[PDB]
Every structure is written in C-alpha cells, then in structure tokens.
Amino acid sequence: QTQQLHAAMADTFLEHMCRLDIDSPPITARNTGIICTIGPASRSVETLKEMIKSGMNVARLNFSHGTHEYHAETIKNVRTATESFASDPILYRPVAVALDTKGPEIRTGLIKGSGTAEVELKKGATLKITLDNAYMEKCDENILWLDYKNICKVVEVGSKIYVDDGLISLQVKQKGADFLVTEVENGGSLGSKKGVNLPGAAVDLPAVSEKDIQDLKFGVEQDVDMVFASFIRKASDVHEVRKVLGEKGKNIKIISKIENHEGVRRFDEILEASDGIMVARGDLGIEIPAEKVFLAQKMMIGRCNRAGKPVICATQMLESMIKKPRPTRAEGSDVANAVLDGADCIMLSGETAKGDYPLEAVRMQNLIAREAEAAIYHLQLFEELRRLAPITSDPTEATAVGAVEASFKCCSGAIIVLTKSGRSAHQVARYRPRAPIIAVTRNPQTARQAHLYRGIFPVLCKDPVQEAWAEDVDLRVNFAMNVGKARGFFKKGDVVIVLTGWRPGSGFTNTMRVVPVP
Amino acid sequence: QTQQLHAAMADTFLEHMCRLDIDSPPITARNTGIICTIGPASRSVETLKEMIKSGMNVARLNFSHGTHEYHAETIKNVRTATESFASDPILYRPVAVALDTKGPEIRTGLIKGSGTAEVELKKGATLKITLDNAYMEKCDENILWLDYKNICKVVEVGSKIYVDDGLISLQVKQKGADFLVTEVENGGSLGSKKGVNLPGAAVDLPAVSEKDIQDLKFGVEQDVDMVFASFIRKASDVHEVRKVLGEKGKNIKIISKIENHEGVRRFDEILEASDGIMVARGDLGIEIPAEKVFLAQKMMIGRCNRAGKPVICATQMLESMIKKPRPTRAEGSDVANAVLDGADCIMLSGETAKGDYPLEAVRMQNLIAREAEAAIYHLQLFEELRRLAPITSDPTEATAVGAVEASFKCCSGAIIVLTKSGRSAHQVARYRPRAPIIAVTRNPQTARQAHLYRGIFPVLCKDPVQEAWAEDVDLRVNFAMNVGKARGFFKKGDVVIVLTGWRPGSGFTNTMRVVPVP
Amino acid sequence: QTQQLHAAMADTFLEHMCRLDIDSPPITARNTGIICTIGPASRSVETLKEMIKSGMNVARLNFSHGTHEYHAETIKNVRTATESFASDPILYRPVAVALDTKGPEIRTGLIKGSGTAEVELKKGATLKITLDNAYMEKCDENILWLDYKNICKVVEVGSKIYVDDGLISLQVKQKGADFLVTEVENGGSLGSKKGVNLPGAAVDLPAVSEKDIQDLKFGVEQDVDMVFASFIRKASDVHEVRKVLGEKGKNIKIISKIENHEGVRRFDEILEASDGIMVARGDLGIEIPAEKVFLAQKMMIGRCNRAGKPVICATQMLESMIKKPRPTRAEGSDVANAVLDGADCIMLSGETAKGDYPLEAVRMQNLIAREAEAAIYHLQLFEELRRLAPITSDPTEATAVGAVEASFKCCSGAIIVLTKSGRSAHQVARYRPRAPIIAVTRNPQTARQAHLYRGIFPVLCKDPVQEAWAEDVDLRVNFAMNVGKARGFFKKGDVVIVLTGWRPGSGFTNTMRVVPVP
C-alpha cells in the first residue's frame, strides 16, 4: 500500500496516526508550492535552471535589499532559465515572480565605517541610540543610530528593542527627546544595517513608504505576478497597496504578510481584503513571544483554508541548511507539519538566497512536502471543509465539490481543469483533493499565479485556438492527458476526472466527466 | 478566554484551529515532562539548581561518553541540587535520573596532530577507511579509522556510509579485507570520535555489549530510575536489558530508543516488552530518509498513546540554542507539534549538555509545552481514546476513566491520586485529562518515575503513617490539596477530583470523589 | 451474544442497524416506565395486583370521566394492591398515581334513551348541532348536543368538526345562532359523551376551569404523585396549575400534555415551566395533520432528553389490543421506536382502562421496551448527550457523568444511587446509561416519582436509620445489592457502580465506587 492509503482508511485520527508507514511510498506529484528567495547563491541562469528542476515554483525577490538594476537582472535570469524549458509545453513548468516589499522596517546605521565591520556588544554594558544622522555611519558598542525618527515617541523605559533577527536585545533605561540609554540583555556580534523590532510599541511608520511606492511601480513595470506586502496591520493597509498598484496592477495578487501583533488581531479584516496570506514567522516571532507563534500559524492556515485563500508558511523552515547539506530533525518536522496544518505553499529565504546548499534545500522541501501530503487525513479534512463551506447555488462550486468527491471515490490520477483566470482550479483546490489538479490555461499569468494553490499543477497550452470550440476543448484536455503521462502522474489505464464548461469564456465550468486516460 | 477554551469548544478540528488565540493565556501547570542531558555546561550543583527551577524533571546521563567515576559525580550533584529543596515537601520537585546506554555505536578515531582541529572532506575526493589500529589516533582527510571490526563484512561496493550526525556521506568504491576506499558525496569538516551509520547494512554488534552490561549494573548500584536503551531492534533486545537489570533492578523502567529501520518495523513487539519509548530522531533520521522521520514519530507517539505507555520525543528540538539564546521558528514549531502529537516528554541533548544556553533551552521548552498543551483538541482526543481503549472488567480502569470524564465536566483544577507504585496515576494520564494529575506517594522512586507520564505532578509525602488508615489517606489528600494551592493550581473555592482505594496496598483504587478545595 | 452488544460496538449508525440480532436476548431489567390508565377493565384490587406483576409502574386516572368518589376508590384500590407486596421490601415495587385533568375539552351529550345506545351516521347526511340543553340527553342521528357554549362564535361555514377520536368528521354548512347545520363527511356509529375537536378554531375555554381546580385540589388531598395537565398551550397555563396545587402540593410533578398546535409552537416555554412532558398524540393527531405527529413526537422527546426532563409517549400505542390478544405490526414498531426516540415512559389508555386484554397489553409494552432498550446506539447517544451537556460546576453532575462513563467502561450490572429527593438518580438517568439505576430512598414519594425517568428502578428502604451514618449508608447500599440479586439484575461476582454523598441531607452526592456485588 502506497501514499499511506492504509492510514487514510482509519476511522479515527488517532488510528490514522498509528498507521503512518515509512515503508509506504508517496505518489509522484507534490502538491505544496515551493517559494524560493533568489540572491547571490541562486541568481545565475545556470543555478536557476537547477532550482526549477529541483522544485521551485515561485521566485521571491526581497526588496528590503538591492537596487532596481540588481532585481531587474535577477528577474531577467529567472525568465531566461524558465524559458530554456519552453520548447516542450508538455514538460514546461511555469515559474512565478514575487516582489516582497521592504515596508515599514527600522534598521541601524554603519559600524566603524566598513559595512563589513562588526562591534561585539558586551552584556550588561550600556548603549546610546542616536537619531542624529551624523552617526548614521558612526556605529560602535557605544552609539547606535536607527532609521525610525519617531522612535522616542512610542518607546518607554523598561521597553525592549531587538536587533538582527531579534538575537541581540536591549532594555530602554533612559528615554530622552532624541536619545535612548539602554543596557544590553544578551548582546553579541553586531553588524551594520540590521533589523530592529519594538515589541508592544505601536510603530507609526507609513503603510506604504516612498521606497515602497518606487518598488511597487517597478513591480508593475517588470510584470511581477504577486506582491508579498510586509507588516500588514489592518485592512486599510492592504487597500493602500491595492490603490497604489491601481489599474495597471489590478491583476497582481496581494499576499499580506502577518508579522506583528496587530496583524494577528485584525487578521479577519486583512484576509478579506487580501488575495492570500503569508505567515512571516521571522518578525512575527520577535514581535510576539516565540512560544506563541505555532498558535498564530495554525490559526491563520485554518482561517485561510476555511476561506479558500492561499496561505504561505515562511521563514527558518530549514535554517541550518544555510551551512549544512542536511536539515535538523526539528526542521524536517516543521516542513511536514506546515503541510499537515494545511499551508498551500512553503518558503525558503536565506537557505536559497545566500546559503551554501540552495539546491539541497529546495529538494528537501520537495521531499518532505510529498511525504506529508500523503499523510494528511483526507477523510476528516474533506468532511470538515464540506460542512464548513458557505452554502451556495453557484454551478461552478457544485461542480468543483462533485469532482473532488468523485476523485476520492475512484482514487483518480488527477483532476483536469480548463480555466482562463484560474478560478475553476482554485475552487477545486479549496476542497483539498488528494489527486493533483492539472490546470490547463492559455493565460501565462494565470499559469504562474496558480502555484499559490495547494495541488494545482499549472500547464500552459500554446496551441492555436481551433475554430470549432468543441475541438479546442478536447485539444486542451488531451494536452493535459499528455502532461500527466509524461510526468508520471498516471498512465493509459487509469481513470481521471475532467472539468470543462458549456460555453467559451470564464465563469461557465459546469461539466464533470470520469474518463480513462487514452 | 483562558487556556484556549474557546477553541476547546469547536465542533470540528478545522474550527478548533481557527480559534487558537495568542491572547488566550495558559494555566500555570505544564504537563509535558522535560528531560535534560547533563554535561559540562550543566554539571555543577549551582546550575543544576537553576535547571530544576527552570523546569527540568529528568536528568539524562549519556553513557556514550565518560567514566563511571565521572557519572557517579554527576549523579551526586543532581541529588545534592535536588535535595537542596527537600526541607519543604509542599514545594519539593522530585527529579529522576536516567541512564542512556552507549549500545552498538560505531565511532571514528582521533584526528592526527590536532585531535579535534577538523580535516576538510570535499565532494568527490577519495577517503580510505581502515581498521588498522596504527591509525586510530592518526585520522585525516586521506585515511579514517573506525570502531567496527566487521564493517567490511556487512558493506558492499555502492554502500553508503554516514559520519557525524549523518552530515558527511561516503560511497564505498572498493572493498578490501581490512579497508574500504570511498568517494566523498556530502563533504564537510571531520572531527574526532564521530558517530557512523551504515543505513541498509545489517550491523552485527550486540544490542547489549560487555560495556553496556557494566554500565547497566552500575546504574543499579547508583539507584537510577530508568534506562534509555540505545538501538533496540526487537523484543529480545529489551528482554536482555531486563535480565541484566535483574532482580535488584526490577523496578527500574526500560525505555527502548527506536533509532533504526528495524526498530520501527518491529515496533509493536518492542513496545509490548518495554515500559516506554523514545523516538531517538538523531540516529533515526540518518538510518531512514530524513523526510520520513515525522511519519515514524507520529506513528510511535500514536501507538504508545493507544497503549498508555510513555513516549519521549528527542533530539535537535532546540538545536540552534546550543549557540544562540533564542530558537529558530522551526524549533519552536517542533516542540509544539511533539506535544500536540501526544508526546509524554520532550528532551534536550546538546542544548543542555554542552551549549551556551542550557537554562534558556529548558525555559523555552517549558513555555512552548504549556502553550501547546492548552491548544490540544481534547474533545476529539478523549473521545477517540475512549472508543479505542480495550473494554475491561478492571475496576481501577473504570474509576480512572470516570475521573477524567468528571474532570472535563466540572473543569476541575486537578485530579488527585494516591498511588504506591504510580499505576493508578498512569491509568488516569493515558486518558489525557486537561487538568493536572497530582500523584501523592510516599515511595520516592515512584515520585521520580512519574515524570515519564504526561500531566502527572508527583509529590512525595514525608508525613509519618497514621495508625488509622482513614486518617492516613485523608492526610495525604490534604497534602495534595496544599501542594495545589501553593503551586497555584487551584484556590480554596475550586473543585477537584480525588482518587483513593478501598484498602491499603497496590491495586485497589476504586473510589472517585468530587471535592471542593479546603 | 447478549443485549445487542455486537451492534453496540458498531462504528456507524448504519452498521449498528445491520447488526441488530433477533437472536441476541436482552437483560432482565426493563428501563422504560409503563403508565397504565385504570378503568372498568383494571380497577379491581385483584386485577391491579396482576397489572403490577405485569409491569405497571404508574396508575393514570382520567378525570374527564368519573366522580371524585369514583376516583378516590380507584386510588384506594391501587394502594391496596401495591401495599399487598410491602411485606418484602426487597421485591416490593413502588407504584405511582397520576391525575390527568379533563381540561378544556368538548364533549357531546347522551344518545336517545339508553346510555349504551348508539346511532348510525351516514356519509353525506346532515346533522344539526344544538347547544340547547333540552337535548343534552336526546342526542341522535338528526340532532347532536355539545357542551361548548361559544362553539358557534369560533367556527365558520365550511369548518371541519371531528367527533369521537377524530373518527367522525363534520363540515359546517350553515352557522346558526345556537346551532350548526353540518354535513357528515365520514360516517360511523355515534355514542354518548364523545370528544369533539375544532382544528384551526381558537377555542376559548379556560386552561384551568372550575372543575379542574376542584380535581387538582382533590389530587393534593389524595396525595397523588404527579398531574398530567391536558391541553397546555403556554407557560402561563402551567403556572396556573402550579398555583392551584400550591404550597401544599409543591412537590407534585406537573407533566404538561402537548396536544394542540399552540402547545407545540410554544413548547420551549412550556417545558421550562414544567417538570415533564407528555406527547398526547390522540388529540395532537386531530389538532394537527396526522402525518406530522411523528415530527412533533421526535422534536419533543429530543428536547426533553436535552433538558433532562421526563417525556411520555402516549396514546394508541397498542390500540388493536383493546379487542385482540396480540398487537398489529405497526403497534409493535411504534412502542419500539418511542423507546429508541428516547421516551422515558410509554403509556396505555383504552388498552388498560376498558380493553379485553389489559394484562396482555402491559406485558407486550414490557417485552418490546426491553428489546428496544438494548437496541439503542449508546455510543452515539452518550457522546451527543455529553457534547450538548451544559457547562456547570455542580459536583453531583460531575459525579453522575463520571459514573455513567465508568458503567460503560466495565459493562457494570447497575449504578446504585442513594437519594433523598431523587435528584441524584435523575442526574444519572439523563446521561442514559445502559445499566439500570437502582435508586435507594427512604422517601416514599421520591420512590414513586422516580418512575418518570428512564432506567431508574426505585427501591424503598424501610430499615430504621442507623446510629452511625457510615453504617446507615452501607446498610442502604447492601439493600440495593440484595434487590439486584433477587430480581436477576446481577450476581455475586459482578462489578457495579455505587454513588453516595459525604454527609446527610440533599445536594451532597459526590462519591463513586466501583465494587463487586457481595
């Protein structure tokens, strides 16, 4: 028995667990999207080709660093690498491009001139925070300059301040009108231009900064597929991003990053206004007690799953692999549990942006995700999603649920879906079938954006439109049939589910057929 | 909302998840036992006191290193630290001592010229493995001496050999009588005396070596509470440890460590013969594919939960804390998910034996475990444990289940249980009540051993025996009542469940009372 | 296999059904209370003794017939028969007395000449209804006198009028001053003083008339155990009855009878004000469409089960047995489904009051009830009762649920409960254990009223209160022990549950012990 089907038949979750079998191999298709941050270790066209081969579906560009020229080149390399595979539509894997905004970050100045300079702070020692730009290049164990000008207006005595991924901490002892005297909690090696967090402090920086305005315009110019908006705190923050992207960027998806307490508190507002969510655990785990992160993570994945909107689990998933070729046991666990929680996508940051083993990190996420997907208790999941979904008389929705139910009944090799905008394939995915969803579209952007959804394997048909619509439909269904055969998802004998519409244009999916693979 | 009680009332697991609230604080009681490995960083009487204050419940001695003299002094320090709190029975926290065997380990020799300054192994290079003792202290990038004399008999050309927590990988290119020429796959730095794994080979080292026998007997002499037996592969290995402990060590608990494929395959047989299980993920994630570990972990926790036997999740849970004062997000997640999976105890190894932040590591596990315990979906868990639990005409079992049912009905502050051997408390714990189980005993060994079970807070009553048994029982009940108040588990008005028996001696628990706190 | 235990282990309700076995004999104990209407056929002391031996637990006196002098003698006979078994407390069975009011009913007058005389009513013929007392004793096929003075003011032309258990239907053609010219739709023999129904009409008779007031005070004077209040339409009707019973009758249980559309619509407020409910289907099935009666029945049993208040399924359950010694297949099915629905008691009216086979009808209800009780799917029922069980801190409640859970765990022979007011035993029965609840009391009225609750086998202890309270408790527990053994509920080696308190007086039940039967 493969893909944990024995465990799949358990009548209780406990027995389901008891039945998980390390000797029960998973299927070929991996449903969870893998998002990779591109940087120095993975920027080349050559390495990008291997990233794609290893499993990358989305390339994330972090705009909290780098110039527009730098990112434009990275994007150009991503596309060169992605199109080197275009000559064979059957095997071509679309790759999306995501712009991750700097957003309202607070950073520090330069250490002793050299940007590569590092001052090792002494615990218990003191430290003065300067807002005097004269020191924005003069940083050492005694004077530290920040980006945030209104810092004194929101911080008090006793308050803590974290620097560099929240490792170096500080306690505000003396508050001035433009200065801060603090004592090191647990210092260490302090480099320059590091991230600073002010937990509990209501930072007043702008939802969309000047830099962010520049970057978003650039995103539109570069034709990015999505924007990961940093530090979203409320629905109005998302709306600002939306309005700034405006008309020209109207089809760009906005993924709100939840990384502070206010974002968690106002999560429902944010999700309603967003196209999807990212559980940005780096800042989140500095912003709120590290021990409460898993709670916020499971809450958000659960709500996104309930809403049918994409949710990404991010940050430090395979951290140790920045230096080692194998992950720690906690990391293998974290990736598997993010998938079991229900995340549509999992992400890599420093692991692929700058680490020594970018390809190994991608391959490991592919490996763990696939094993975890087979371990999902679909019996309970499908039942709860069905019962918890709003009641409606939308023909497409009824067709979507019937196809997933039919797919479980016959253990189909796939659910083939023709879609222009991606919507019909999204409706199927929210029900979480075990079988992969081959989404056939002629729209290159829907093909790339589809990766945000668990189980959707976007396929881009390049065939000219046949004059006879019925033949044009069969041509795309056969194209999917060919893809499934070439990819090892299924074979000639197998049974597959096929979703199509009654007429041309979006919004008319209403036909479900159980067909054998030709 | 407190202790995630809003999420607690969800009618589905998905909505349960949707309700997890980072602003819903947990109770004061932390149910999951914390096992700490003692070493250079935590050996002193003074830091051991903080270890205990920080949450350590069990001190683990790793016999893969050190002499009997060394370990006896560790044991003495643990007891000194533990008894420095004995003057106040109401606040005294029993601390167990666990002996973790070396078992059938394979280790490399010493690096030459600098017995630690590592040699660099590069992918593609060649490295010869020798058994010629002339090289046992002259290992380098070209020749590596190993511990296992029959290694050449169980490996073949093409076999894979892993070194140092499986971070270094080699492939046998040529086989010799007393050597192997290999090619390096995953390279890295090689230090001295590192662990070696031969996945897929049938290593013939005895499960219990002569050294293991010496150590086990030493464990009996030193009055240890439990043994963590390394590399258990089948029930007969367990029986062998049992025999070595013999009559004098008959009350010492045997926890079989599962760390190779065979252990997983014969798990049921091993579980039946053992007192409990350790999911020893270090070796397990080298022995089987890293991406399959979470499957084996959930299978074992689920099965031991079904059997009512203790299970320990171990290794690399807060790894990065060996060097940093704060854990990665994957580690925070790992500890939380182990508890949610149902692990009775969690463990620290390098984090407490040698890291720079042992105290912080202990405190973090305490914090995460308590948050995760509140997030458990008891509604489904208790229901499934009941249905799956073997029906029986056993009075004590019926009393235990009724007490847990009653604790949920009146949200009791605790279930107080008088126990001589610990059995009555173990029987309550297997049903997983939300309320803590205060186990009152006069037996010091059962007070220490009780820590292996989720939710049991052992309290050692020193009061002399009353002539009138009824009064002696009431005296012990009031003691529990006092511990709970001083510990902040409940107040004078609260309601608590209390279990007692019909006559003195073990095995007569049959009385359940719902009593208000005095 | 016995008492459908195989079916009990079923994981789904459908499989539970599939496993029901006509060859799995049930236990001796019958849980559903049997309420019998006393009349000419069952009024003699000699026949009453047999009724009790056959299974009667409650004697119902229908006050819409007979004088106070007549009922007082019936009550006297019921008590003479009941006490004839008093010389042996171990086998003595308490028998309750219920007073069922006439309430706002409408009846015709006497048929010409004789009082047994009847007239033939042909379909299509016309019949005139008069209110002119000159004809109240001259009723015949041409003129029918009724006792509802405002009838002409609440009815219209075309209105339907039913006579004699809704078997004769009349349609109003001409609405006269103090008469009605009607057309017979369904013919049949008309007798004297038959019940009349005006479905749809807003009959304005008093909830509690002057005669009902007198009968209710008579009930108090006669020391009846409960009142079955006819035609309750709202909470204020119940309050009126309570006020009439008043301070002296404050302990008499009020069971509101739901038999009209309004009582069903305002059911929740009626239940809150009442002690129990009776699903009075005779009138109900005339007042509302016959095809909807089962909906009202299952809604009421469900809501009563939810609130933990007694519910009686009544009327025409074994109708054909008024004339035949065996019931129809529909009747056997009806009794069984009333029990499966969750009815605390089932009732007999004409079958025992005037039928030719009173004893056989009682025996049949006993036989069917016992078979059905074993066929209940307790696995789902108990789980749902708990899930829906309110959140409280009452110790007695937590003890009751704990005892029921424990009874399922060890398949106990019984749950023995010492109770003064009966409340503690009521609390156990609301959770619907499979095991019988032997309620031991010294209070004769509580022993009598306990029959309203499914599963409570009331037992009246006559022994004098022992000096020492502990021995008095043990004395009462041992008494229940003797009862269970004498009646074949259990035997010496059996395990049973025992519930007692920590001090005399009501409201202190808090102790549960699992013990073998002496």
Ligand SMILES: O=P(O)(O)OC[C@H]1O[C@](O)(COP(=O)(O)O)[C@@H](O)[C@@H]1O
């Ligand atoms: O998912 P979307 O955007 O609603 O598209 C699904 C639509 O595509 C179809 O398969 C039609 O395809 P085309 O317009 O591409 O020929 C419809 O029949 C269906 O309404």
Ligand SMILES: O=P(O)(O)OC[C@H]1O[C@](O)(COP(=O)(O)O)[C@@H](O)[C@@H]1O
């Ligand atoms: O859990 P165990 O080992 O069975 O001990 C519970 C036993 O302890 C008791 O409370 C008796 O206590 P002492 O024998 O008084 O410690 C019994 O009544 C009960 O049988």
Ligand SMILES: O=P(O)(O)OC[C@H]1O[C@](O)(COP(=O)(O)O)[C@@H](O)[C@@H]1O
């Ligand atoms: O069900 P009730 O009316 O609350 O009675 C149960 C009560 O009876 C008891 O068994 C006491 O019995 P007695 O008062 O008749 O001696 C208590 O201990 C208990 O509180």
Ligand SMILES: O=C([O-])C(=O)[O-]
């Ligand atoms: O920005 C992020 O991705 C984070 O903080 O984790």
Ligand SMILES: O=C([O-])C(=O)[O-]
């Ligand atoms: O031995 C251990 O604890 C392991 O291998 O994880």
Ligand SMILES: O=C([O-])C(=O)[O-]
């Ligand atoms: O009154 C009743 O009992 C009825 O109408 O069924």
Ligand SMILES: [K+]
């Ligand atoms: K950010």
Ligand SMILES: [K+]
């Ligand atoms: K080991």
Ligand SMILES: [K+]
């Ligand atoms: K009637």
Ligand SMILES: [Mg+2]
């Ligand atoms: Mg950013």
Ligand SMILES: [Mg+2]
């Ligand atoms: Mg060891």
Ligand SMILES: [Mg+2]
């Ligand atoms: Mg009546």
